[PDB]
Design a protein around this ligand. Structure first.
Ligand SMILES: NS(=O)(=O)c1ccc(C(=O)Cn2cnc3ccccc32)cc1Cl
Ligand SMILES: [Zn+2]
Length: 258
């Protein structure tokens, strides 16, 4: 099945999920001189309840923090979006070296990692699974991580990783103050695109913050110790899990700021 190893990695996904070569694939290169400032874009309106986080698990492809998305306690609005997008999950992408770990790349700069906060349009769709197959279904906030001071909220995640080393393991995880994790400035770029993992559905309104947050090199390194293999199987480590940038194919990247 798919992954980030030689035989099953990003270059091979198109062999078995053909939309990998679609017209609205993510991530992308963000070229700040080509982006269009758009005065119609709104500031982000962010409400994240720390009690929404419930579980952290190892998917084999990243960790995911799952949020109880039963009602509208944690929602994203404003920005480019019409309507209210409910928080579902958070995960991270990184590389084998701090030099190059993000998925979006800004004028050639790859950051050490990139956080994705995944939301779905509950004003139009009845569930995440239905939302995930519609162009206006999902909204993902991407946040870059650069190496710097340890991050006290991220420490809560790294303290759990020993318990979820094997693919499929889960453990409880709550009181995660995602709002406080975000960087001081919420100025962003936005474009229409896709999931960056199979099934690569073109259902995502991407909202990429310009300002990175910090993580220490030691905290970042703990993520590379997760396994992409299940309990009792030949161990392989998830040292890298980012997809390369995909062709822009004439999409408009807009800026909320100039
Ligand atoms: N890396 S990404 O941030 O673009 C992303 C990565 C994963 C997912 C998922 O929710 C994966 N997933 C897990 N179960 C799914 C059912 C339907 C559609 C997608 C499903 C969503 C997203 Cl938006
Ligand atoms: Zn992602």
């Amino acid at each position: 099945s798919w992954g980030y190893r030689e035989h099953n990695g990003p270059i091979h996904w198109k062999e078995f999920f053909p939309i990998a070569d679609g017209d609205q694939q993510s991530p992308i290169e963000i070229k700040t001189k080509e982006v269009k400032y758009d005065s119609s874009l709104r500031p982000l309106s962010i409400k994240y309840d720390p009690s929404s986080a419930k579980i952290i698990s190892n998917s084999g492809h990243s960790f995911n923090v799952d949020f109880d998305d039963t009602e509208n306690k944690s929602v994203l609005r404003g920005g480019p979006l019409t309507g209210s997008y409910r928080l579902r999950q958070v995960h991270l992408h990184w590389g084998s070296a701090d030099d190059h770990g993000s998925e979006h790349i800004v004028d050639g700069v790859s950051y050490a990692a990139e956080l994705h906060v995944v939301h779905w349009n509950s004003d139009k769709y009845p569930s995440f699974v239905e939302a995930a197959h519609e162009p206006d279904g999902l909204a993902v906030l991407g946040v870059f991580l650069q190496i710097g001071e340890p991050n006290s909220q991220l420490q809560k995640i790294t303290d759990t990783l020993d318990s979820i080393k094997e693919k499929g393991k889960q453990t409880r995880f709550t009181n995660f103050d995602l709002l406080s994790l975000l960087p001081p400035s919420w100025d962003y770029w936005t474009y229409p695109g896709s999931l960056t993992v199979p099934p690569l559905l073109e259902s995502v309104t991407w909202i990429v913050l310009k300002q990175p947050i910090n993580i220490s090199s030691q905290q970042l390194a703990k993520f590379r110790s997760l396994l992409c293999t299940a309990e009792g199987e030949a161990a392989a480590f998830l040292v890298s899990n980012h997809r390369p940038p995909q062709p822009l194919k004439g999409r408009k990247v807009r800026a909320s700021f100039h």
